[PDB]
Amino acid sequence: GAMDTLYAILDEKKSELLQRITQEQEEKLSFIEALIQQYQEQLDKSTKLVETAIQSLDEP
Amino acid sequence: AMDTLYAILDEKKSELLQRITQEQEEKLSFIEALIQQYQEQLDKSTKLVETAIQSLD
Amino acid sequence: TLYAILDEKKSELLQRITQEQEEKLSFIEALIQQYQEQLDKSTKLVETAIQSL
Amino acid sequence: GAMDTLYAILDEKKSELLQRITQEQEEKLSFIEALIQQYQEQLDKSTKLVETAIQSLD
């Protein structure tokens, strides 16, 4: 009947919505991971610069 | 009747869509837990760095 | 009077070592300030970026 | 020799002035060294903190 069709459609819509939300969340996750990596690298570079400058100051 | 036949078919289609929806929910649940964990790690890190910054003042 | 001579030299030596160490302190202070500024910039950037999500 | 004496007194005086100047130089220099050492220690504590932040992001 028409009511069975309607519910099947709503279930399909539910799966499609989950799919859309998932893709957007996956994008969110990737951006977060690329952000953490860049931050980490910035923090690492700066600290290595600093520890090298001090180590070399008290020397050469 | 095409009714009883189409009914059994619809049951199996429905089961398959349920299986797919279940898997989708699992995967989305995992992505979201990961996003929260990374955000918390990022938060802790910025706090540690701000402590570092202030300790140089 | 000989110790006056030796104390003049010591004073001149103290003066040069002092300028060298002042320079050292100057470099350290600037290095530290530079570190702080970079740490801070990186941190503000990441938080801003997070906020834009 | 009135002029000799004046020089002698002045001779004593410069030595005394010198000893005060030297003592002050050492006090300034020692202070500068403490300040350097203090800063180097803060910077070390600071870098380990950033290292812990970096390790957190793993």
Author numbering:
A (entry chain A): -3 to -1, 214 to 270
B (entry chain C): -2 to -1, 214 to 268
C (entry chain D): 214 to 266
D (entry chain B): -3 to -1, 214 to 268
What does the paper say about this structure?
Muscle-specific RING fingers proteins (MuRFs) are E3 ubiquitin ligases that associate with the sarcomeric cytoskeleton reportedly through their CC domains. MuRFs form the C-II TRIM class, whose C-terminal specific fraction contains a COS (C-terminal subgroup One Signature)-box motif and an intrinsically disordered acidic tail. MuRF1 targets components of the contractile sarcoskeleton; namely, myosin, troponin-T and titin. Despite their functional diversity, TRIM proteins invariably share a tripartite fold consisting of a RING finger (R), one or two RING finger-like B-box domains (B) and a helical segment predicted to form a coiled-coil (CC) motif.
To gain an insight into the assembly of the CC-prone segment identified, we elucidated the crystal structure of the corresponding fragment from human MuRF1 (MuRF1CC) to 2.1 Å resolution. The crystals contained four copies of the MuRF1CC chain in their asymmetric unit. These assembled into two parallel dimers, each having an ‘open scissor’ conformation that intercalated through their C-terminal ends to form a palindromic, inverted tetramer. In MuRF1, however, the chains within each dimer are out of registry by one full heptad-repeat and their crossing angle is broad, leading to the unpairing of both N- and C-termini. The resulting exposure of hydrophobic residues at the C-terminus permits the formation of an interchain hydrophobic core that supports the assembly of the inverted tetramer. Other than that core, the contacts within each dimer are few, with only two salt bridges (K224-E236’ and E236-K238’) providing chain recognition (analysis of chain interfaces used PISA). One additional salt bridge (K238-D268’’; chains DA in figure 3a) is present in the structure, but it contributes to tetramer stabilization. The analysis revealed that MuRF1CC can establish manifold interactions, being able to support concurrently the formation of parallel and antiparallel dimers and tetrameric helical bundles. In the MuRF1CC tetramer, helices arrange themselves along the same interfaces as those occupied by the COS-box α-hairpin in the ab initio models.
